[PDB]
Amino acid sequence: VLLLDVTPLSLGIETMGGVMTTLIAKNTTIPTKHSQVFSTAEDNQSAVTIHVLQGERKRAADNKSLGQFNLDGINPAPRGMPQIEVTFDIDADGILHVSAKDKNSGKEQKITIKASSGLNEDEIQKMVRDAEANAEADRKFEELVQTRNQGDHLLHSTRKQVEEAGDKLPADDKTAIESALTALETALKGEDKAAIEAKMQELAQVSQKLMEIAQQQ
Amino acid sequence: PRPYLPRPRPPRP
């Protein structure tokens, strides 16, 4: 054949730290369907937002938003443990159906995105060239995000542990922990991997008595 | 293994 009807750009969803995760690759023939299992970003997260994106960039913010919906009622669990199956199905009319289902709770939500949605022909070409020009930067970004996400997880577990510790935690330690949490927060907004890892360390150094407390029966 | 999803945005602070 000299003509194939295809989805012109990659389609996927936003995942923790502003990353596009692709479910259907650019230039896939239609009709087509693919599924991938995702999980929660934080301990005891009760809901997830499925932000649907079209484009080739690894930074979610530089792709085209097609829609979003939420799925709630996720039962309490450690982050990473719930199984949220997300399915993209593009039919022969180019209509995109996106669903998310939590395997433990059985709850599901879906949206339908009409075929005219997303980028036009001129924006499609610009997008492909944009991603080609930014391929190395986007590699660096994904590295930065793995470190940001560790940073983010430590900040949350530490805050949870301070709450649970309450007045068992000495006043000098809480002050030092508070400062170090704020510092980690600030670093996480920059693009410097070493700076994040550095504040993670500074937080750990003031956290020994806390770790001891969290650890006992 | 699985990639992680963000939570819905709460009301503005």
Q: Same structural domain for residues A22 and A55?
A: yes
- B4: part of which helix (H) or strand (E)? strand B4-5
Q: Same structural domain for residues A116 and A143?
A: no
Q: Same structural domain for residues A100 and A21?
A: yes
How many angstroms separate the CA atoms of A69 and A113, rounded?
A: 12
**Angle between helices A208-215 and A171-188 in degrees, nearest 10:** 110
Which of A101, A135, A169 is the last residue before a domain boundary? A135
Task: Show the beta-strand stretches assigned E in chain A.
Answer: 6-7, 11-15, 19-24, 28-29, 32-40, 47-54, 64-72, 84-90, 96-102, 108-113
Residue A93: how many other CB atoms lie within 10 Å = 10
The whole-angstrom distance between A4's CA and the closest CA on chain B is: 31
Q: Same structural domain for residues A67 and A42?
A: yes
Tokens of A7: 């989805």
Map tokens 């602070």 to a residue.
B13
User: How many structural domains comprise chain A?
Assistant: 2
Computed on alpha carbons and rounded to an integer, the radius of gyration of chain B in Å comes to 11
Q: Are A157 and A80 in contact (CB under 8 A)?
A: no
Q: Same structural domain for residues A163 and A148?
A: yes
Which whole-number Å values give the CA distances from A203 to A174, A199, A200, in the listed order? 11, 6, 5
- Its sign, for the CA torsion A98, A79, A203, B8, is positive
Q: How far apart are the first and last CA of chain B?
A: 33
Method: X-ray
Q: Same structural domain for residues A47 and A119?
A: yes
Find the domain containing A193 and state its range.
136-217
How many angstroms separate the CA atoms of A139 and A131, rounded?
A: 11
Cβ neighbours for A133, distance < 8 A, ≥ 6 positions apart: none
How many angstroms separate the CA atoms of B7 and A160, rounded?
A: 17
How many angstroms separate the CA atoms of A97 and A19, rounded?
A: 21
Resolution of the entry in angstroms: 1.6
Which residues of A are less than 8 Å from B7 in CB distance? 40-42, 45-49
Supply the CATH number for residue A204's domain: 1.20.1270.10
How many angstroms separate the CA atoms of A156 and A172, rounded?
A: 20
Using a CB–CB cut-off of 8 Å, the residues of A that contact B are 13-16, 19, 21, 36-42, 45-51, 70, 72, 79-80, 83-84, 149
Which whole-number Å values give the CA distances from A149 to A31, A79, A106, B8, B9, in the listed order? 35, 12, 28, 17, 18
Interface test with B, best of A19, A45, A74 (most B CBs within 10 A): A45
Q: Are A21 and A102 in contact (CB under 8 A)?
A: no
Q: How many CA atoms lie within 13 A of A205 on its CB side?
A: 10
Which residues of A are less than 8 Å from B10 in CB distance? none
Partners of A102 in the β-ladder: A84
The whole-angstrom distance between B9's CA and the closest CA on chain A is: 8
